[PDB]
Amino acid sequence: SPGIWQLDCTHLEGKVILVAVHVASGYIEAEVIPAETGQETAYFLLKLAGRWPVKTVHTDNGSNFTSTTVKAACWWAGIKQEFGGVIESMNKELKKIIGQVRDQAEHLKTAVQMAVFIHNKKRKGGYSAGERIVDIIATDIQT
């Protein structure tokens, strides 16, 4: 289903990485956030929904979505919670790539975004996740 995204936070070096994955394609978007908070989650959700057609979001930590702030962002953007192996393979893959480029950047946040870039452009055959998301979404638009 083209509008389903998974969102979770992971921890590395005392910092928090918010990782969103488009389930159908494996494409990822991520930000290094200063603290795991409802305000940061909500802002990221609003950003994501203005960039891709987000219809539902699933998470592996349901308590991440209970705050008034996050509920308001889902209300404004028209997102609903998705009620039920791709995601597991994309988050340890992301730490694996982060580990490989970590010494190429001074800051962790730079390495995270290098890892997103490598991830999304990797052809798996056999197109990349970035190629798959735009095909999926463009195909969905044309009826």
Show the DSSP H helices in 34-128 as ranges: 38-51, 68-77, 86-101, 108-121
Is 88 known to sit in a ligand binding site?
A: yes
The residues with which 56 forms a beta bridge, in sequence order, are: 4, 80
| Distance from the Cα of residue 39 to its chain's centroid | 16
Task: Please tell me the distance from the alpha carbon of residue 77 to that of residue 100, in angstroms, as a whole number.
Answer: 36
Is 103 known to sit in a ligand binding site?
A: no
Contact between 44 and 31 (Cβ < 8 Å): yes
> What element of type H or E holds 135?
helix 129-141
- Amino acid found at 32: V
- CATH number for the segment(s) 1-143: 3.30.420.10
